[PDB]
Amino acid sequence: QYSA
Amino acid sequence: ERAGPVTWVMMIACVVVFIAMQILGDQEVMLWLAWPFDPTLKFEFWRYFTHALMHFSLMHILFNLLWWWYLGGAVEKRLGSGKLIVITLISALLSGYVQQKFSGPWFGGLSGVVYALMGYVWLRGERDPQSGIYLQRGLIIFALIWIVAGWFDLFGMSMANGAHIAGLAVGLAMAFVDSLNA
Ligand SMILES: [Cl-]
Ligand SMILES: [Cl-]
Ligand code: NA
Ligand code: NA
């Protein structure tokens, strides 16, 4: 999971 | 007022999606809106854009929408709804493509667009000063700090570094292109  | 229709509809859209994510959980909404994570999803064409409508944390939706409201709102008022539309389409698509190339498709968030707006407004003001768009000294310090925060991951979760690089690049390049005109 990655924020964009 | 302040918010043109494009600025407004994006804010509404991000809020509606965020609510859906609190009710259903993040991954159920990723299943529908994320960049295609399975070959069978490659023709669902909204996915190349709708990754930008999802936020995993309250603090990131608030700051993204604040920057979007301010810079997005400025671009729309001074340059038109359509200009904001194309910046948004291009930054969402290229930032998502660069992000999944480096790290896969499990990403989301408007910053890619926010980074393009920051670079766009700043560079356009620096090169084409009196088209009516510029980033004041103070705010660009706070944009520079926001950018440094993401690069060195001073935030909660992992940062989408490729989205974030591609979005800024898109913004500076469109501002350069728009600066050649006069
Ligand atoms: Cl407003
Ligand atoms: Cl990354
Ligand atoms: Na975000
Ligand atoms: Na960010």
Coordinates of N, CA and C and ligand atoms in Angstrom, one line a residue, unseen atoms left out:
Chain A
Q1 N 0.8 -1.2 0.0 CA 0.0 0.0 0.0 C 0.8 1.3 0.0
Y2 N 0.4 2.3 -0.8 CA 1.2 3.5 -1.0 C 0.3 4.7 -1.2
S3 N 0.7 5.9 -0.6 CA -0.2 7.0 -0.7 C 0.4 8.1 -1.7
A4 N -0.5 8.4 -3.3 CA 0.1 9.6 -4.1
Chain B
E1 N -18.3 33.0 -3.7 CA -17.7 31.7 -3.8 C -16.2 31.7 -4.1
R2 N -15.7 30.7 -4.8 CA -14.3 30.4 -4.9 C -14.1 29.1 -5.8
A3 N -14.9 28.1 -5.5 CA -14.8 26.8 -6.2 C -15.7 26.8 -7.5
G4 N -15.0 26.8 -8.6 CA -15.7 26.4 -9.9 C -16.2 25.0 -9.9
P5 N -16.9 24.6 -10.9 CA -17.5 23.3 -10.9 C -16.5 22.1 -10.9
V6 N -15.3 22.3 -11.6 CA -14.4 21.2 -11.6 C -13.7 21.0 -10.3
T7 N -13.3 22.1 -9.7 CA -12.8 22.1 -8.3 C -13.8 21.5 -7.4
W8 N -15.1 21.9 -7.5 CA -16.1 21.4 -6.6 C -16.4 19.9 -6.8
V9 N -16.5 19.4 -8.0 CA -16.9 18.1 -8.2 C -15.9 17.1 -7.8
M10 N -14.6 17.4 -8.0 CA -13.5 16.6 -7.5 C -13.6 16.5 -6.0
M11 N -13.8 17.6 -5.2 CA -13.9 17.5 -3.8 C -15.0 16.6 -3.3
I12 N -16.2 16.9 -3.9 CA -17.3 16.0 -3.6 C -17.0 14.5 -3.9
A13 N -16.4 14.3 -5.1 CA -16.1 12.9 -5.5 C -15.1 12.3 -4.5
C14 N -14.1 13.0 -4.0 CA -13.1 12.4 -3.1 C -13.8 12.2 -1.7
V15 N -14.7 13.0 -1.3 CA -15.4 12.8 -0.1 C -16.4 11.6 -0.1
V16 N -17.2 11.5 -1.2 CA -18.0 10.4 -1.4 C -17.2 9.1 -1.4
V17 N -16.1 9.0 -2.2 CA -15.3 7.8 -2.2 C -14.8 7.5 -0.8
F18 N -14.3 8.5 -0.1 CA -13.7 8.3 1.3 C -14.8 7.7 2.2
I19 N -16.0 8.2 2.2 CA -17.1 7.7 3.0 C -17.3 6.2 2.6
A20 N -17.4 5.9 1.3 CA -17.5 4.5 0.9 C -16.4 3.6 1.5
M21 N -15.2 4.2 1.6 CA -14.1 3.4 2.1 C -14.3 3.2 3.6
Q22 N -14.8 4.2 4.3 CA -15.1 3.9 5.8 C -16.1 2.9 6.0
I23 N -17.2 2.8 5.1 CA -18.2 1.9 5.3 C -17.8 0.5 4.9
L24 N -17.2 0.4 3.7 CA -16.8 -0.9 3.1 C -15.4 -1.4 3.4
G25 N -14.6 -0.5 3.9 CA -13.2 -0.8 4.0 C -12.4 -0.4 2.7
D26 N -11.2 -0.1 2.9 CA -10.4 0.4 1.8 C -10.3 -0.6 0.6
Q27 N -10.0 -1.9 0.9 CA -9.7 -2.8 -0.2 C -10.9 -3.1 -1.0
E28 N -12.1 -3.1 -0.5 CA -13.3 -3.3 -1.3 C -13.4 -2.1 -2.3
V29 N -13.0 -0.9 -1.9 CA -13.1 0.2 -2.9 C -11.9 0.1 -3.8
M30 N -10.8 -0.3 -3.4 CA -9.7 -0.5 -4.3 C -10.1 -1.5 -5.4
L31 N -10.8 -2.6 -5.0 CA -11.3 -3.6 -6.0 C -12.0 -3.0 -7.1
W32 N -12.7 -1.9 -6.9 CA -13.4 -1.2 -8.0 C -12.7 -0.1 -8.7
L33 N -11.9 0.7 -7.9 CA -11.4 1.9 -8.4 C -9.9 1.9 -8.6
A34 N -9.2 0.9 -8.2 CA -7.7 0.9 -8.3 C -7.3 0.7 -9.7
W35 N -6.0 1.1 -10.0 CA -5.3 0.8 -11.2 C -5.5 -0.7 -11.5
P36 N -5.7 -1.2 -12.7 CA -5.9 -2.6 -12.9 C -4.8 -3.4 -12.3
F37 N -5.2 -4.3 -11.4 CA -4.3 -5.2 -10.7 C -4.3 -6.6 -11.2
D38 N -5.1 -6.9 -12.3 CA -5.3 -8.1 -12.9 C -5.5 -7.9 -14.4
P39 N -4.8 -8.7 -15.3 CA -5.0 -8.5 -16.7 C -6.4 -8.4 -17.1
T40 N -7.3 -9.1 -16.5 CA -8.7 -9.0 -16.8 C -9.4 -7.7 -16.5
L41 N -8.7 -6.8 -15.8 CA -9.2 -5.4 -15.5 C -8.7 -4.4 -16.5
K42 N -7.9 -4.7 -17.5 CA -7.2 -3.8 -18.3 C -8.2 -2.9 -19.2
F43 N -9.4 -3.4 -19.4 CA -10.3 -2.6 -20.3 C -11.3 -1.7 -19.5
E44 N -11.3 -1.9 -18.1 CA -12.1 -1.0 -17.3 C -11.3 0.3 -17.2
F45 N -11.7 1.2 -18.1 CA -10.8 2.4 -18.4 C -10.9 3.4 -17.3
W46 N -11.9 3.5 -16.5 CA -11.9 4.4 -15.4 C -10.8 4.2 -14.4
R47 N -10.3 3.0 -14.3 CA -9.2 2.6 -13.3 C -7.9 3.4 -13.5
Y48 N -7.7 3.9 -14.7 CA -6.4 4.6 -15.0 C -6.5 6.0 -14.4
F49 N -7.6 6.4 -13.9 CA -7.8 7.7 -13.3 C -8.4 7.6 -11.9
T50 N -9.2 6.7 -11.6 CA -10.0 6.7 -10.3 C -9.1 6.4 -9.1
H51 N -7.9 5.9 -9.3 CA -7.0 5.7 -8.2 C -6.7 7.0 -7.4
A52 N -6.9 8.1 -8.1 CA -6.7 9.5 -7.5 C -7.8 9.9 -6.6
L53 N -8.9 9.2 -6.6 CA -10.1 9.6 -5.8 C -10.1 8.9 -4.4
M54 N -9.2 8.0 -4.1 CA -9.1 7.2 -2.9 C -8.1 7.8 -2.0
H55 N -8.4 7.8 -0.7 CA -7.5 8.3 0.3 C -7.6 7.3 1.5
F56 N -6.4 7.0 2.1 CA -6.3 6.0 3.1 C -6.3 6.6 4.5
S57 N -6.2 7.9 4.6 CA -6.1 8.6 5.9 C -6.8 9.9 5.8
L58 N -7.4 10.3 7.0 CA -8.1 11.6 7.1 C -7.1 12.7 6.9
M59 N -5.9 12.6 7.4 CA -5.0 13.8 7.3 C -4.6 14.0 5.8
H60 N -4.5 12.9 5.0 CA -4.1 13.1 3.6 C -5.2 13.6 2.8
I61 N -6.5 13.2 3.0 CA -7.6 13.8 2.2 C -7.7 15.2 2.5
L62 N -7.6 15.6 3.8 CA -7.7 17.0 4.2 C -6.7 17.9 3.6
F63 N -5.4 17.5 3.6 CA -4.4 18.3 3.0 C -4.4 18.3 1.5
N64 N -4.7 17.1 0.9 CA -4.9 17.1 -0.6 C -6.0 18.0 -1.0
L65 N -7.1 17.9 -0.4 CA -8.3 18.7 -0.8 C -8.0 20.2 -0.6
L66 N -7.3 20.5 0.5 CA -6.9 21.9 0.8 C -6.1 22.5 -0.4
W67 N -5.0 21.8 -0.7 CA -4.2 22.2 -1.8 C -4.9 22.2 -3.1
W68 N -5.7 21.1 -3.4 CA -6.6 21.1 -4.6 C -7.5 22.3 -4.6
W69 N -8.2 22.5 -3.5 CA -9.1 23.7 -3.4 C -8.4 25.0 -3.8
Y70 N -7.2 25.2 -3.2 CA -6.5 26.4 -3.4 C -5.9 26.5 -4.8
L71 N -5.0 25.6 -5.2 CA -4.3 25.7 -6.5 C -5.3 25.3 -7.6
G72 N -5.9 24.2 -7.5 CA -7.0 23.8 -8.5 C -8.0 25.0 -8.6
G73 N -8.5 25.5 -7.5 CA -9.4 26.6 -7.6 C -8.8 27.8 -8.3
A74 N -7.6 28.2 -8.1 CA -6.9 29.3 -8.8 C -6.8 29.0 -10.3
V75 N -6.3 27.8 -10.7 CA -6.2 27.5 -12.1 C -7.5 27.6 -12.8
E76 N -8.6 27.1 -12.2 CA -9.9 27.1 -12.9 C -10.4 28.6 -13.1
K77 N -10.2 29.4 -12.1 CA -10.8 30.8 -12.1 C -10.0 31.6 -13.2
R78 N -8.7 31.5 -13.2 CA -7.9 32.3 -14.0 C -7.7 31.8 -15.4
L79 N -7.6 30.4 -15.6 CA -7.3 29.8 -16.9 C -8.5 29.0 -17.4
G80 N -9.5 28.7 -16.6 CA -10.7 28.0 -17.2 C -10.8 26.6 -16.6
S81 N -12.1 26.1 -16.7 CA -12.4 24.7 -16.2 C -11.6 23.7 -17.1
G82 N -11.5 23.9 -18.4 CA -10.9 22.9 -19.2 C -9.5 22.7 -19.0
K83 N -8.7 23.8 -18.7 CA -7.3 23.7 -18.3 C -7.1 22.8 -17.1
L84 N -7.9 23.0 -16.1 CA -7.9 22.2 -14.8 C -8.2 20.8 -15.2
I85 N -9.2 20.5 -16.0 CA -9.5 19.2 -16.5 C -8.3 18.4 -17.1
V86 N -7.6 19.1 -18.0 CA -6.5 18.4 -18.7 C -5.3 18.2 -17.8
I87 N -4.9 19.2 -17.0 CA -3.9 19.0 -16.0 C -4.3 17.7 -15.1
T88 N -5.5 17.7 -14.7 CA -5.9 16.6 -13.8 C -5.9 15.2 -14.5
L89 N -6.4 15.2 -15.7 CA -6.4 13.9 -16.5 C -5.0 13.4 -16.7
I90 N -4.1 14.4 -17.1 CA -2.7 14.0 -17.5 C -1.9 13.6 -16.3
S91 N -2.0 14.4 -15.2 CA -1.3 14.0 -14.0 C -1.8 12.7 -13.4
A92 N -3.1 12.5 -13.4 CA -3.6 11.3 -12.7 C -3.1 10.1 -13.5
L93 N -3.1 10.2 -14.8 CA -2.8 9.0 -15.7 C -1.3 8.7 -15.7
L94 N -0.5 9.8 -15.8 CA 1.0 9.6 -15.9 C 1.5 9.2 -14.5
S95 N 1.0 9.8 -13.4 CA 1.5 9.5 -12.1 C 1.1 8.1 -11.7
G96 N -0.1 7.7 -12.1 CA -0.5 6.3 -11.8 C 0.3 5.3 -12.6
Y97 N 0.6 5.6 -13.9 CA 1.4 4.7 -14.7 C 2.8 4.6 -14.1
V98 N 3.4 5.7 -13.7 CA 4.8 5.7 -13.1 C 4.8 5.0 -11.8
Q99 N 3.7 5.2 -10.9 CA 3.7 4.5 -9.6 C 3.5 3.0 -9.7
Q100 N 2.7 2.5 -10.6 CA 2.5 1.1 -10.7 C 3.7 0.4 -11.3
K101 N 4.4 1.2 -12.2 CA 5.7 0.6 -12.8 C 6.7 0.3 -11.8
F102 N 6.9 1.2 -10.8 CA 7.9 1.0 -9.8 C 7.5 0.1 -8.7
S103 N 6.2 0.1 -8.3 CA 5.8 -0.5 -7.0 C 4.4 -1.2 -7.1
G104 N 3.8 -1.4 -8.3 CA 2.6 -2.1 -8.4 C 1.4 -1.2 -8.2
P105 N 0.2 -1.8 -8.3 CA -1.0 -1.1 -8.5 C -1.8 -0.7 -7.2
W106 N -1.3 -1.1 -6.0 CA -2.0 -0.8 -4.7 C -1.6 0.6 -4.2
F107 N -2.1 1.6 -4.8 CA -1.8 3.0 -4.5 C -3.1 3.7 -4.7
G108 N -3.2 4.9 -4.1 CA -4.3 5.8 -4.3 C -4.0 7.2 -3.7
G109 N -4.8 8.1 -4.1 CA -4.6 9.5 -3.5 C -4.5 10.5 -4.6
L110 N -4.9 11.8 -4.3 CA -4.9 12.9 -5.2 C -3.5 13.6 -5.2
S111 N -2.5 13.5 -4.6 CA -1.3 14.2 -4.5 C -0.5 14.3 -5.8
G112 N -0.7 13.0 -6.5 CA -0.1 13.1 -7.8 C -0.6 14.3 -8.6
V113 N -1.9 14.5 -8.5 CA -2.5 15.7 -9.1 C -2.1 17.0 -8.3
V114 N -2.1 16.9 -7.0 CA -1.6 18.0 -6.2 C -0.2 18.5 -6.5
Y115 N 0.7 17.5 -6.7 CA 2.1 17.8 -7.1 C 2.2 18.5 -8.4
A116 N 1.3 18.0 -9.4 CA 1.3 18.7 -10.7 C 0.8 20.1 -10.6
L117 N -0.2 20.3 -9.8 CA -0.7 21.7 -9.6 C 0.3 22.6 -8.9
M118 N 1.0 22.1 -7.9 CA 2.1 22.9 -7.3 C 3.1 23.3 -8.3
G119 N 3.7 22.3 -9.0 CA 4.7 22.6 -10.1 C 4.1 23.5 -11.2
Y120 N 2.9 23.2 -11.6 CA 2.3 24.1 -12.6 C 2.1 25.5 -12.2
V121 N 1.5 25.8 -11.1 CA 1.2 27.1 -10.6 C 2.5 27.9 -10.4
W122 N 3.5 27.2 -9.7 CA 4.8 27.8 -9.4 C 5.5 28.2 -10.7
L123 N 5.8 27.2 -11.5 CA 6.6 27.5 -12.7 C 5.9 28.5 -13.6
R124 N 4.6 28.4 -13.8 CA 3.8 29.3 -14.7 C 4.0 30.7 -14.2
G125 N 3.9 30.9 -12.9 CA 4.1 32.2 -12.3 C 5.5 32.7 -12.5
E126 N 6.5 31.8 -12.4 CA 7.9 32.3 -12.5 C 8.2 32.7 -14.0
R127 N 7.6 32.0 -14.9 CA 7.9 32.2 -16.3 C 7.0 33.2 -17.0
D128 N 5.7 33.0 -16.8 CA 4.6 33.8 -17.4 C 3.9 34.6 -16.4
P129 N 4.6 35.6 -15.7 CA 4.1 36.1 -14.5 C 2.7 36.7 -14.5
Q130 N 2.3 37.4 -15.6 CA 1.1 38.1 -15.7 C 0.1 37.5 -16.6
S131 N 0.0 36.1 -16.5 CA -1.2 35.4 -16.9 C -2.2 35.2 -15.7
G132 N -1.8 35.7 -14.5 CA -2.6 35.8 -13.4 C -2.5 34.6 -12.4
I133 N -1.5 33.8 -12.6 CA -1.3 32.6 -11.8 C 0.1 32.6 -11.3
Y134 N 0.2 32.5 -10.0 CA 1.5 32.4 -9.3 C 1.3 31.8 -7.9
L135 N 2.4 31.3 -7.4 CA 2.4 30.8 -6.0 C 3.2 31.7 -5.2
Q136 N 2.6 32.4 -4.2 CA 3.3 33.3 -3.3 C 4.4 32.6 -2.6
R137 N 5.5 33.3 -2.4 CA 6.7 32.9 -1.6 C 6.4 32.0 -0.4
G138 N 5.5 32.5 0.5 CA 5.1 31.7 1.6 C 4.6 30.4 1.3
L139 N 3.5 30.4 0.4 CA 2.9 29.1 0.1 C 3.9 28.2 -0.6
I140 N 4.8 28.7 -1.4 CA 5.7 27.7 -2.1 C 6.7 27.2 -1.1
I141 N 7.0 27.9 0.0 CA 7.8 27.3 1.1 C 7.0 26.2 1.7
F142 N 5.7 26.3 1.9 CA 5.0 25.3 2.5 C 4.7 24.1 1.5
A143 N 4.7 24.4 0.2 CA 4.6 23.4 -0.8 C 5.9 22.6 -0.8
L144 N 7.1 23.3 -0.8 CA 8.4 22.7 -0.7 C 8.5 21.8 0.5
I145 N 8.0 22.2 1.6 CA 8.1 21.4 2.8 C 7.2 20.2 2.6
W146 N 6.0 20.3 2.1 CA 5.1 19.2 1.8 C 5.9 18.2 0.9
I147 N 6.5 18.7 -0.1 CA 7.3 17.8 -1.0 C 8.4 17.1 -0.3
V148 N 9.1 17.8 0.5 CA 10.2 17.2 1.3 C 9.7 16.1 2.2
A149 N 8.5 16.4 2.9 CA 7.9 15.4 3.7 C 7.6 14.1 3.0
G150 N 7.1 14.2 1.8 CA 6.8 13.0 1.0 C 8.1 12.3 0.6
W151 N 9.1 13.0 0.1 CA 10.3 12.4 -0.4 C 11.0 11.6 0.7
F152 N 11.1 12.2 1.9 CA 11.8 11.5 3.0 C 10.8 10.7 3.9
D153 N 9.6 10.6 3.4 CA 8.5 9.8 4.1 C 8.4 10.2 5.6
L154 N 8.2 11.4 5.8 CA 8.0 11.9 7.2 C 6.5 11.6 7.6
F155 N 5.8 10.9 6.8 CA 4.3 10.6 7.0 C 4.1 9.2 7.5
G156 N 2.8 9.0 7.8 CA 2.4 7.7 8.3 C 2.8 6.5 7.5
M157 N 2.2 6.3 6.3 CA 2.4 5.2 5.5 C 3.4 5.4 4.4
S158 N 3.7 4.4 3.6 CA 4.6 4.5 2.5 C 4.1 5.5 1.5
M159 N 5.0 6.3 0.9 CA 4.6 7.3 -0.1 C 4.8 6.7 -1.5
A160 N 3.8 7.2 -2.3 CA 3.9 6.8 -3.7 C 4.9 7.7 -4.4
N161 N 6.2 7.3 -4.4 CA 7.2 8.2 -4.8 C 7.2 8.4 -6.3
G162 N 6.9 7.3 -7.1 CA 6.8 7.5 -8.5 C 5.6 8.4 -8.9
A163 N 4.5 8.2 -8.3 CA 3.4 9.1 -8.6 C 3.8 10.5 -8.3
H164 N 4.3 10.6 -7.0 CA 4.6 11.9 -6.6 C 5.6 12.6 -7.6
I165 N 6.9 12.0 -8.2 CA 7.8 12.5 -9.2 C 7.1 12.7 -10.5
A166 N 6.3 11.8 -11.0 CA 5.7 12.0 -12.3 C 4.7 13.1 -12.2
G167 N 3.9 13.3 -11.2 CA 3.0 14.4 -11.1 C 3.7 15.7 -11.1
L168 N 4.7 15.9 -10.3 CA 5.4 17.2 -10.4 C 6.0 17.4 -11.8
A169 N 6.6 16.4 -12.4 CA 7.1 16.5 -13.8 C 6.0 17.0 -14.7
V170 N 4.9 16.3 -14.7 CA 3.8 16.7 -15.6 C 3.4 18.2 -15.4
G171 N 3.4 18.6 -14.1 CA 3.0 20.0 -13.8 C 4.0 21.0 -14.4
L172 N 5.3 20.8 -14.1 CA 6.3 21.7 -14.6 C 6.3 21.7 -16.2
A173 N 6.1 20.6 -16.8 CA 6.2 20.5 -18.2 C 5.0 21.2 -18.9
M174 N 3.8 21.0 -18.4 CA 2.7 21.7 -18.9 C 2.8 23.2 -18.7
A175 N 3.4 23.6 -17.6 CA 3.6 25.0 -17.3 C 4.6 25.6 -18.3
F176 N 5.7 24.9 -18.6 CA 6.7 25.2 -19.6 C 6.0 25.4 -21.0
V177 N 5.2 24.3 -21.3 CA 4.6 24.4 -22.6 C 3.6 25.6 -22.7
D178 N 2.8 25.8 -21.7 CA 1.9 26.9 -21.7 C 2.6 28.2 -21.6
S179 N 3.9 28.2 -21.2 CA 4.7 29.5 -21.2 C 5.2 29.9 -22.5
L180 N 5.4 28.9 -23.4 CA 5.9 29.3 -24.7 C 5.0 30.2 -25.5
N181 N 3.6 29.9 -25.4 CA 2.6 30.8 -25.8 C 2.8 32.2 -25.2
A182 N 3.2 33.2 -26.0 CA 3.4 34.5 -25.5 C 4.4 34.5 -24.3
Ligands
CL1 CL -15.3 27.6 -2.2
CL2 CL 7.2 4.2 -4.7
NA3 NA -2.7 10.8 -0.2
NA4 NA 1.4 13.2 -0.3

